């Protein structure tokens, strides 16, 4: 039984690969010669946010494009007014090993999680004036890698126990558990339409999921070792990736295969974060090299570098407005670029 | 006015300094070991679904935070990157166990990890009590798993505890030497292994951790001050 099923699965995999090869009548590099290269993109540190005691692990801009929450391994979430550097809040955490943080799209809540396997929801607007733990979403059997709000009531989270899940915050239950990954799930990106989301795992594969149906739709595998970061192209039909294999990859949902890979032979270190600019023309990735490289998403050539960090660049984000780019590092300083 | 916002920010920064003092005063420790190892008994006997546990204990006016990782996938390729730049890693093994080769492989993986290349390891050769009578009885032979023990004799620098049968000393020092060779092969001097013959009932575990942390900080400052 097992051998026959393996043969059938291999036949299906061969069919999928043949279909993808047939669809690859052209590659992005040939098409993108029709557009002018972006050229030299230079950004300067407009702000430097300090106050975190230890390594910064995560950060997330608010939809207002001004406030941004940040997390550090010392057990603090600090909300910054990036314009003025004012510390709007400072939330002490139950567990100091926080690996992710999110800002609710409405701006009312922030979430965080880490090696505690619990996604804590914090209410930034309560009549007592303090910041209160609204919910403690428990049920994952591994550390939390990423989380992103869908609504004030729904949040999707990745875990190191190979599962992503969708949570109903009010009831504190898992609406639907996503399974199929074989290794630790390291990051997830929520589509602009909010109906689909894609997560990369410690295996070579990044999988696309449908929250309404609660099941994987397709899988991508064009990576060598381990996917650390993932981001959705602004149009929502493509997503980037970052791996320990020291290269980015651009996939397309409709084509269902790799479109482009961004790497230079002199970059031999893993990628910790990935993000796109507002138009999607620039692909920004943070590396263990202590600096972030700006890639031309179409021409696939480096257009800049953000080297103003003293340690591993662990997180990276771009404002919904597209004005600025934030970055966090293990040196405990966030820096807004532009 | 936005001036009150700056006032709020400065109260926040005052609190951040206040807890920065506490953060810098405390020493963090990572606790590792297999389920056979009695690390749980060690932490429980620290007389001052969820993931990391925490134990707070103090020895001679200096406090420590020890982090025991609980419900997680068997792999630690990623979550051990968080525990970089801790003061020390405490590794606990069941000497009496045979899974000894599994413990050796685990210690190899921890020692050679690229994110823990500067973190000293406080190695607890735990459960000496069981090992002692396991060797004395003779119902099992360590040579079955490590035949090199048949042609091995206790070194000249060994210091057996007051009163000990030669065979138990030989066995315990053979295991300790296995771990020590593992440590030294890749050891470039940037981190050190501090082996200890420990049992969960021993009350010196806190003292041993404190002494090894004192030495680790001594060497860190010595390296900082260009003296090495």
């Amino acid at each position: 039984e097992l051998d026959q099923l393996r043969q059938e699965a291999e036949q299906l995999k061969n069919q999928i690969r043949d279909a993808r090869k047939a669809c690859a009548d052209a590659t992005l590099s040939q098409i993108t010669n029709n557009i002018d290269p972006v050229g030299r993109i230079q950004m300067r540190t407009r702000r430097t946010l300090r106050g975190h005691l230890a390594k910064i692990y995560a950060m997330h801009w608010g939809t207002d494009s001004r406030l941004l929450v940040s997390a550090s391994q010392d057990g603090k979430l600090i909300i910054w007014d990036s314009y003025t550097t004012n510390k709007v809040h400072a939330i002490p955490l139950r567990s100091s090993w926080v690996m992710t943080c999110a800002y609710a799209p409405s701006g009312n809540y922030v979430a965080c999680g880490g090696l505690d396997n619990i996604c804590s929801i914090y209410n930034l607007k309560t009549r007592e004036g303090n910041v209160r733990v609204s919910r403690e979403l428990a049920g994952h059997t591994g550390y939390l890698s990423c989380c992103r709000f869908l609504d004030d009531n729904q949040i999707v989270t990745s875990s190191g126990d190979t599962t992503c899940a969708l949570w109903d915050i009010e009831t504190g239950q898992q609406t639907t558990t996503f399974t199929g990954h074989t290794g630790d799930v390291m990051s997830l990106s929520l589509a602009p339409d909010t109906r689909l989301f894609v997560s990369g795992a410690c295996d070579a594969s990044a999988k696309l999921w449908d929250v309404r149906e609660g099941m994987c739709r397709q899988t991508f595998t064009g990576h060598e070792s381990d996917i650390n970061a993932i981001c959705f192209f602004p149009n929502g039909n493509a997503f980037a990736t970052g791996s320990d294999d020291a290269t980015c990859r651009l996939f397309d949902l409709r084509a269902d295969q790799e479109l482009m890979t961004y790497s230079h032979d002199n970059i031999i270190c893993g990628i910790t974060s990935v993000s796109f600019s507002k138009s999607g023309r620039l692909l920004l990735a943070g590396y263990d090299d202590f600096n972030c490289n700006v890639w031309d998403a179409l021409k696939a050539d480096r257009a800049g570098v953000l080297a103003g960090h003293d340690n591993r660049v662990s997180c990276l984000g771009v404002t919904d407005d597209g004005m600025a780019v934030a970055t966090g590092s293990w040196d405990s300083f966030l820096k807004i670029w532009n | 006015e936005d001036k009150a916002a700056v006032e709020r920010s400065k109260m926040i920064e005052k609190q951040l300094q206040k807890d920065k003092q506490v953060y810098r005063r405390t020493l963090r420790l990572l606790l590792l070991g297999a389920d056979n190892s009695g690390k749980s008994t060690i932490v429980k006997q620290m007389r001052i679904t969820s993931g990391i546990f925490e134990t707070k204990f103090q020895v001679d006016k200096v406090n420590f935070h020890m982090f025991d990782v609980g419900a997680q996938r068997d792999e630690r390729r990623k979550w051990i990157q968080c525990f970089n730049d801790v003061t020390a890693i405490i590794f606990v093994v069941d000497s009496s166990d045979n899974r000894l080769q599994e413990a050796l492989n685990d210690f190899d993986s921890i020692w050679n990890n690229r994110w823990l290349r500067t973190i000293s390891v406080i190695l607890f050769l735990n459960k000496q009590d069981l090992l002692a009578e396991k060797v004395l009885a003779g119902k099992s032979k360590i040579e079955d798993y490590f035949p090199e023990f048949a042609r091995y004799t206790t070194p000249e620098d060994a210091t057996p505890e007051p009163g000990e049968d030669p065979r138990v000393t030989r066995a315990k020092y053979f295991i300790r030497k296995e771990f020590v060779d593992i440590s030294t092969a890749s050891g470039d001097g940037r981190h050190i292994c501090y082996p200890h013959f420990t049992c969960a009932v021993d009350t010196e575990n806190a003292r041993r951790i404190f002494n090894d942390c004192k030495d680790i900080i001594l060497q860190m400052n010595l390296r900082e001050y260009n003296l090495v």
């Epitope: 004012n86 701006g107 007592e128 303090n130 | 006015e1 009150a4 916002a5 006032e7 109260m11 005052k14």
Partner: single-chain antibody, 228 residues
């Protein structure tokens, strides 16, 4: 959330008294504190301000030096000593909650207050003292300021208060564009920089009272009343 002021009564002009209020239901430490007096048959007048953490303290020139404000965070008690009193000082004093940060709503809560009876500043004006109206439709209330309240930061520091008969003033709109927490969709506001307008989309009998406009670039307007 509950603020109750204590003290008041009858005091001779040459006497002194200490007004005390107890804060309950919220973190009094993080909330800034303002004192607002409501003299008989006239509008509100700011008295003093103390920042959170006993930091910046301000007094109105009419009461500068004469009064001193004290804060006690651990007891959640606010104190205000009046060394000497004049006849004009008679007024009902409110305990106005306030916290300041990007997106906050200062002056959101007003305490019950106590009546104390005794035996350059920015000037603003309102279009009319009274405006007869009926429920089920909208009306417009406007006010003017001596100088543009639009600071270089890109926002106007003005607030609107509603004082129902026998009830403390309530914050309707802050910064001319943001509705308070809990206020219904019955209110809206707009302006150009020097003249602002408060528009009630649909009036109801439960909102009877007098409207005050205040700027925080603290002085209040003459007050506009709605006659149903």
């Amino acid at each position: 959330v509950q603020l109750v002021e204590s003290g008041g009564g009858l005091v001779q002009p040459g006497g002194s008294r200490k007004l005390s209020c107890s804060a309950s239901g919220f973190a009094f430490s993080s909330f800034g504190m303002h004192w607002v007096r409501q003299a008989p048959e006239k509008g509100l007048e700011w008295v003093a301000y103390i920042s959170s953490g006993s930091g910046t303290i301000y007094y109105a020139d009419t009461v500068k030096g004469r009064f001193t404000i004290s804060r006690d965070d651990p007891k959640n008690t606010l104190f205000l000593q009046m060394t000497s009193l004049r006849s004009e000082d008679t007024a009902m004093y409110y305990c106005v909650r306030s916290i300041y940060y990007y997106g906050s709503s200062p002056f959101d809560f007003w305490g019950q207050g106590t009546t104390l009876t005794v035996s350059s500043d920015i000037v603003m004006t309102q279009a009319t003292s009274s405006v007869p109206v009926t429920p089920g439709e909208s009306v417009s209330i406007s006010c003017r300021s001596s100088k543009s309240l639009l600071h270089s930061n890109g926002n106007t520091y003005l607030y609107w208060f509603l004082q129902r008969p026998g009830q403390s003033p309530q914050l309707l709109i802050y910064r001319m564009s943001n509705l308070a927490s809990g206020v219904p969709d019955r209110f809206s506001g707009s302006g150009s920089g020097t003249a602002f307008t408060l528009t009630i989309s649909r009036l109801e009998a439960e909102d009877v009272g007098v409207y005050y406009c205040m700027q925080h670039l603290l002085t209040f307007g003459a007050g506009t009343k709605l006659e149903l």
